[PDB]
């Protein structure tokens, strides 16, 4: 798994891979690793598939109950802390989860919280999570600026997942892109790595190691 999210001028970019494995066996190439919590909240998922799906789907129910009770959308901080407090109750039981809770509010602005099944909860500008996180960090850190266009930021996120999809054996399949703004998240398509790799190689002039 490789998932990333970073804050920038035009809000937040979220990018994830699509692969699921059981040992060396490739179980799925079409996994949805971004969960649409509401029109303004996104959750990435890494680690145990069931743990992540169940509890982030559950998180959406808790966030919906909040805005029914409080007549106001839940903050990214509060949404992330509901999940982190939940997994903390289960600490030691063997849950396996690594997530970014990404969203935008008026009071907070664009916010990213990393939440993890050990109980860790961290606010930050850039995060990469999963088995291929180090590969994503390499591309992301060397090319990141606050002043990036929506178009350039989206490509950087896409390219960082591609890098990890290539090198990490347990990452791959396809790239799902999201862009979170003042007016909510925007989906930017499924990008198959089998076609994206050759496209990027030719146009960018990268991956000169590989033959094509």
């Amino acid at each position: 798994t490789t998932t990333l999210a970073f804050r920038f001028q035009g809000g937040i970019i979220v990018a994830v891979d699509s692969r699921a494995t059981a040992g060396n066996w490739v179980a799925s190439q079409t996994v949805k690793k971004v969960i649409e919590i509401n029109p303004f909240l996104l959750g990435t998922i890494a680690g145990g598939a069931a743990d992540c799906q169940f509890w982030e789907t559950w998180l959406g129910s808790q966030c919906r109950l909040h805005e029914l009770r409080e007549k106001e959308r839940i903050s990214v901080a509060a949404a992330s802390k509901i999940l982190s407090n939940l997994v903390y109750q289960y600490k030691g039981a063997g849950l396996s989860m690594g997530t970014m809770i990404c969203g935008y509010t008026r009071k907070e602005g664009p916010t990213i919280y990393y939440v993890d099944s050990d109980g860790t909860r961290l606010k930050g500008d850039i995060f990469c999570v999963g088995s291929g996180q180090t590969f994503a960090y390499g591309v992301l850190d060397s090319n990141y600026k606050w002043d990036l266009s929506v178009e350039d930021a989206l490509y950087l996120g896409k390219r960082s997942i591609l890098a990890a999809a290539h090198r990490d054996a347990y990452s791959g399949g396809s790239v799902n892109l999201y862009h979170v703004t003042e007016d909510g998240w925007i989906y930017h398509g499924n990008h198959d790595v089998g076609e994206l790799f050759w496209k990027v190689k030719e146009e960018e002039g990268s991956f000169n190691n590989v033959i094509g």
């Binding site: 180090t134 590969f135 994503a136 960090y137 390499g138 591309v139 850190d141 060397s142 390219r159 960082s160 890098a163 990890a164 290539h166 090198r167 960018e204 002039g205 990268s206 991956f207 000169n208 190691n209």
Partner: protein, 195 residues
């Protein structure tokens, strides 16, 4: 030891190796050179278990230097790398194997080409445009996949290497106290004293 990197450009091979030596909770030294000159146009960097690394490197060095005197001739990097691989492949089924990973950077004077070989302690040899051992590759291969172009100059290679070291210094937990960089080309081996 920790981090060793290698990159083969147009007309040279550049090896970068960390300076830190850590035993337990203390950094005993911050200026350690994790490499040995096997021949005038062949350099080997190394990392692995304490003691084994130097013992192996010097043993290889002695054998290549012996060959050079006997034949009055320098072995090709390919020939040296094959010799090194066989020693490690022999070692892995010994009573106590050499726990050493190496990079061999050399300039072939016959073919006028730089060559980089990555060999692990099992005796797994691969020729590469860029290579790394340990946790280093987990950060650096993605950068090199993006930026590396084969027709690069030595100066462009050093800039690309700086970008790798900066990423390692940002994201790796261990303080490896910077790197010693060495260039291998047609004129021989030299050390970049400022990095």
């Amino acid at each position: 030891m920790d981090i060793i990197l290698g990159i083969r450009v147009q007309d040279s091979v550049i090896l970068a190796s960390s300076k830190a030596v850590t035993r337990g909770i203390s950094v005993l030294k911050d200026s350690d050179d994790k490499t040995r000159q096997l021949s005038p146009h062949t350099l080997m960097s190394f990392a692995g278990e304490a003691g084994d690394t130097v013992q192996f490197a010097e043993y290889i060095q002695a054998n290549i230097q012996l060959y050079s005197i006997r034949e009055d001739y320098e072995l090709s990097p390919q020939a040296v790398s094959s010799f090194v691989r066989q020693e490690l492949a022999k070692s892995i089924r010994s009573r106590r194997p050499y726990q050493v990973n190496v990079l061999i950077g050399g300039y072939d004077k016959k073919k006028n080409k730089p060559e980089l070989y990555q060999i692990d302690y099992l005796g797994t040899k691969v020729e590469l445009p860029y290579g790394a051992h340990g946790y280093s590759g987990f950060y650096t291969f993605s950068l090199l996949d993006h930026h590396y172009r084969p027709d690069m100059t030595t100066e462009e290679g050093l800039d690309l290497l700086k970008l790798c070291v900066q990423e390692l210094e940002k994201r790796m937990p261990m303080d490896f106290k910077g790197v010693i960089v060495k260039i291998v080309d047609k004129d021989g081996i030299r050390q970049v004293d400022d990095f």
